[PDB]
Amino acid sequence: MIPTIDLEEVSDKILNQKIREASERWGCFRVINHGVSLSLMAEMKKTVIDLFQRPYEVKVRNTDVLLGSGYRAPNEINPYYEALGLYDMASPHAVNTFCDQLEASADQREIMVKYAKAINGLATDLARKLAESYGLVETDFFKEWPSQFRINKYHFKPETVGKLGVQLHTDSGFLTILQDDENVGGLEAMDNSSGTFFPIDPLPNTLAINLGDMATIWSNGRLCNVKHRVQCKEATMRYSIASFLLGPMDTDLEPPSEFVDAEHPRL
Ligand SMILES: O=C(O)CCC(=O)C(=O)O
Ligand SMILES: [Mg+2]
Structure with a gap:
């Protein structure tokens, strides 16, 4: 089961520990009291639904920057x-x-x-x-x-x-x-x-928060890059918004050396 973490937890050591153990064991968690305006989220969703109904020939203008x-x-x-x-x-x-x-x-x-x-x-x-x-x-x-x-x-x-x-x-x-x-x-x-x-x-x-491959590399294998999929449970339309924090793009990602030990050999 995915745990739900309260980002307004008063105690930093409890909050950070909840997050870490969730990120290591499941690779994902929900956050509540995240601080993102609820109205901004709904309007972003309304904007998304409307954006997808733009002319095909307009949508095609959304060019790759990264593949x-x-x-x-x-x-x-x-x-x-x-x-x-x-x-x-x-x-x-x-x-x-x-x-x-x-x-x-x-x-x-x-x-x-x-x-x-x-x-x-x-x-x-x-x-x-x-x-x-x-x-x-x-x-x-x-x-x-x-x-x-x-x-x-x-x-x-x-x-x-x-x-x-x-x-x-x-x-x-x-x-x-x-x-x-x-x-x-x-x-x-x-x-x-x-x-x-x-x-x-x-x-x-x-x-919903999940960890990707970069987190596993950076943490020398401590953080779980969760495997996930979306399964169709009813034949309806469905919208989701995702924001990815990526690894560095010019450099190559290798861990803070605090993570590499004789019990945590490099990957
Ligand atoms: O659409 C969803 O429910 C999840 C989206 C997702 O996994 C992604 O954009 O990488
Ligand atoms: Mg995904």
Whole structure:
């Protein structure tokens, strides 16, 4: 079972410890009292739904910056999935460019600006708490790490229900913040120990956090890069918003040396 962590827990050592053990054992957790405006989240979702109904020929303008950034229409590899997004989410220029590409309204534009700044703050905050949970000196390790924004539209038809919508996988970055679909469940993750899956049901006003491959590398294997998938449980439309804190992009990720011991040989 995925644990729910209270980010307004009064005690730093309890809070950081909860986060670390969740990140090591399950590779994921929910956060409550995250500090992201609930109204901003709903408006971001409204903006997402509306953005996906832009002209196809406009959507196609959402060009890759990184391979996979930008638009992907459903195809025969993964037929139920449509997506948009931008690289370097921390850059107001990058966000604006994305909004220029999708011809967002001015109102929409500034919804995106505010969401990105909020979500990216939650991300830096969570990452720092992870550094703190290990008593690291390098409590700023991520300060030059770029983020990637990606909004997703899942189309499940009656054919799809009972089966999956996306196959089992790990995020390649450090940390992911997911705003799932309020009224359409289906996200599942595998317990590495058992091999069994458990669901990540969309609990209202919460945000889902999971760790990716970069976190495992950085932590020399202590942090779990959770395997997850979304399974179709009903043939409806489905929207989700994801913000990825990635590893460094120019450099190569190797761990703070505090993680590499004679009992933790390098990977
Ligand atoms: O759409 C979802 O429910 C999860 C999204 C996800 O896993 C991703 O964008 O990497
Ligand atoms: Mg994912």
